[PDB]
DNA sequence: GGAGGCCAAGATCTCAATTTCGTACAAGAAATCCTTTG
DNA sequence: CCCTTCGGGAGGTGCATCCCGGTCTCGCTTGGCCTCC
């Protein structure tokens, strides 16, 4: 067993960025800052683990490959347990709650949930979050507006009908109308909660039973639309992400792994190479990512780093150096005994 | 299902330009700058997505074949969803989530919602953003100063009759008394948006509400106006602009590409070299580009990828290199499977 | 004298709309677009504002260096 | 006739609003300096 | 082998736009109803 840190860096080649309940609010998507606004964001390491788990089990998808009949062998058990370590059926090893060594079997007859974890198994492969090395390396991306087709190219309406013409002319009227009442409307909230930081209790409860019931006025006439029930051309909100070219220090760790486990997260991490993506908003290309990850080692008994190689992902390929890489690559490669169907 | 990543260069003919919502302010017009004020425009991955989206779905409209009168089959729902991934009917089939091949079907049958995705289904196209080469290749373009045909020429005065010269008197009369009263009004406002910044917000508020009095003032002020509602001579404010010849680095991904949906885009970009016209401004022929983008497809699994062909649009032509991207964009062409009505 | 009006030799050389009216989301003016550029080519090649502009006029970059001067 | 799936319905309510790196430096030698001067 | 000039003087003004239009969701369990086996 070996304890592998993957200690690196992401090159972001096009912007990264993450959607999070708790940092998005109502006055836009902000990345986690683990602060105010004015703090530094850090991608989550759980997106990452997530990407990189749902790499691991596509190679171990593709290690296993199909059946005869040309259908995956996992079922939704499986899968979810490989996936996401839902034990759906209820049928899992109840290792002991004390016991921290349990599972040895399972660890080395399913090196994917030996190295990602399943519910009431430690994960052997911990996932930093990737932390930017500069003090302005994120910004407000994407955004721009949704512009009517018809309205930016004349020559789109030779194409259209003159019904359908008259269907669109009857939703750009449609759409003016909601849009001059949901203003008006969205203006009475807005005094509303102007009046909402000067009132006392029962002024607020009276206020704020309001605020709902206008809201619901808003759906009801956005409901009424005939032909479209939202309106086409809408600013679209900007997504905060990192630069395009952010030098975000990641740190990954493999823990007392077997040669084969790690070769497992190689295999994964090549096979994320394929498409090097982490977070969304995928329409516009983000989460491309090259990174270099430094692999080390511990001295056996000395607290000392020794460097077992490099794993150097970029679009030209992915570079892995050092023997001992490629010895847990082909071992993960051999030992066929892996048993992931249970 | 390949995994097509375009890699390549878009070189700028005429001045690159967008108006983004987000980074543009009362300041002035600027380009979106990466991470700050004090950092790289990128002209956004929106923009170059939303011109490939309206290119390939006229590219889909010419395959499906307008009719006698110049009119394609297609409704006014069936052009919004492809072209914007927006439903007026409401009718398109949301693919609710935990279905497995969500939208594999439409996928099969419609390429283009493949490619540019749609509400609830995931775009198989990412168009990333074009981040500049270089320290300066940006400018304030545009710019100069409407003036007064008749005030410039004289001899366009010899076109108009003595009473349309007395028009033409009590217009310039008009604009100046009224250009003076709007610098006056102005002037107190600029003095109270000096007098913004004083540390009392609680008088801010005041202060925020007296600006918008003025504003109000200044277009009754405009509204008093029976010659010309806007000042005819006026200086028209820059726009931030990529230079021209300015190399942008472009990557866009297509994951999963099927052939069709390959040769689709191939074409989509093949019609987009008709009229390369990227971003605003084209009253002063700004979007202009000739962009060459190598495809790269990365078996997983493989540590290397291996180059398919080349795209290259430039004003004499459109080259494509390798037998790959031919033999995508014939069985794009060759393809009858597809419906894109719904 | 031309029989145009003044306002007219306006839109059509500068593209101000002096009577003061030129919407451009106008519902009504979605189609119209077609039939104002058919006839009148001037104002479809030369856009106005609300209309675009057929015609993009680009900036005139010297080929060569040194080709400038005070 | 039992046994999977898809949909609708179920109580009222939680609080928070963000603004742009660093400034100026230069020692004892093969050198090519050189090549003189001529 | 001379000996490299004086200074004049350095703008006046215009005018600084209009408008859109800001989304769905869903993080649970159960039974009724539909077809499937």
């Given at each position: 067993m070996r304890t592998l840190n993957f200690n690196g860096k992401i090159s972001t080649l096009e912007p990264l960025t993450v959607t999070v309940k708790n940092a998005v609010s109502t006055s836009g998507h902000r990345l986690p800052r683990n602060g105010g606004f004015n703090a530094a964001p850090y991608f989550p390491g759980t997106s990452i683990r997530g990407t990189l788990r749902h790499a691991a089990h596509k190679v171990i998808v593709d290690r296993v490959g199909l059946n005869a009949d040309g259908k995956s062998p996992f079922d939704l058990a499986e899968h979810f347990m490989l996936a996401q370590g839902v034990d759906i059926n209820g049928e899992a090893e109840?290792?002991?709650p004390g016991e921290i060594n349990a599972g040895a079997e399972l660890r080395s007859k399913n090196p994917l949930i030996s190295?990602?974890?399943?519910?009431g198994l430690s994960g052997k492969v911990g996932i930093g979050n990737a932390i930017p090395d500069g003090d302005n390396q994120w910004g407000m991306f994407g955004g721009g507006a949704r512009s009517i087709m018809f309205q930016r190219d004349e020559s789109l309406m030779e194409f259209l009908e003159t019904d359908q013409v008259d269907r669109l002319e009857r939703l750009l009227e449609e759409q003016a109308e909601?849009?001059?009442?949901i203003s008006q409307i969205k203006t009475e909230q807005?005094?509303?909660?102007?009046?909402?930081?000067?009132?006392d209790k029962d002024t607020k409860a009276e206020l704020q039973i309001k605020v709902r019931e206008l809201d619901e006025k808003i759906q009801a006439r956005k409901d009424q639309k005939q032909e479209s029930r939202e309106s086409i051309r809408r600013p679209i909100d900007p997504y905060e992400a990192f630069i395009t070219g952010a030098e975000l220090s990641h740190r990954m760790s493999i823990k007392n792994a077997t040669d084969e486990e790690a070769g497992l997260f190689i295999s994964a991490l090549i096979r994320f190479a394929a498409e090097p993506r982490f977070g969304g908003h995928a329409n516009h290309n983000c989460?491309?990512?090259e990174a270099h990850w430094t692999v080390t080692t511990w001295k056996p008994g000395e607290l000392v780093p020794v460097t077992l190689g490099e794993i150097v992902i970029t679009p030209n390929g992915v570079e892995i150096t050092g023997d001992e890489l490629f010895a847990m690559v082909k071992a993960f490669n051999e030992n066929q005994s892996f048993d992931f169907t249970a």
């Amino acid at each position: 067993m070996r304890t592998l840190n993957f200690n690196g860096k992401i090159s972001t080649l096009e912007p990264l960025t993450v959607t999070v309940k708790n940092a998005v609010s109502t006055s836009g998507h902000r990345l986690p800052r683990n602060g105010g606004f004015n703090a530094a964001p850090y991608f989550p390491g759980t997106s990452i683990r997530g990407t990189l788990r749902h790499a691991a089990h596509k190679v171990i998808v593709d290690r296993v490959g199909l059946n005869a009949d040309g259908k995956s062998p996992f079922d939704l058990a499986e899968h979810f347990m490989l996936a996401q370590g839902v034990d759906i059926n209820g049928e899992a090893e109840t290792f002991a709650p004390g016991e921290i060594n349990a599972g040895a079997e399972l660890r080395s007859k399913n090196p994917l949930i030996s190295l990602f974890g399943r519910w009431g198994l430690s994960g052997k492969v911990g996932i930093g979050n990737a932390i930017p090395d500069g003090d302005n390396q994120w910004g407000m991306f994407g955004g721009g507006a949704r512009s009517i087709m018809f309205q930016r190219d004349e020559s789109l309406m030779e194409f259209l009908e003159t019904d359908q013409v008259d269907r669109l002319e009857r939703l750009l009227e449609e759409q003016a109308e909601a849009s001059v009442d949901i203003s008006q409307i969205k203006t009475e909230q807005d005094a509303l909660k102007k009046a909402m930081k000067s009132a006392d209790k029962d002024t607020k409860a009276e206020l704020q039973i309001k605020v709902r019931e206008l809201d619901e006025k808003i759906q009801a006439r956005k409901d009424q639309k005939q032909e479209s029930r939202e309106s086409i051309r809408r600013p679209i909100d900007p997504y905060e992400a990192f630069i395009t070219g952010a030098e975000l220090s990641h740190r990954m760790s493999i823990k007392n792994a077997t040669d084969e486990e790690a070769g497992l997260f190689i295999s994964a991490l090549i096979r994320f190479a394929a498409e090097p993506r982490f977070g969304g908003h995928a329409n516009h290309n983000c989460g491309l990512v090259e990174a270099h990850w430094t692999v080390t080692t511990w001295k056996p008994g000395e607290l000392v780093p020794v460097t077992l190689g490099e794993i150097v992902i970029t679009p030209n390929g992915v570079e892995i150096t050092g023997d001992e890489l490629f010895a847990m690559v082909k071992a993960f490669n051999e030992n066929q005994s892996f048993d992931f169907t249970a």
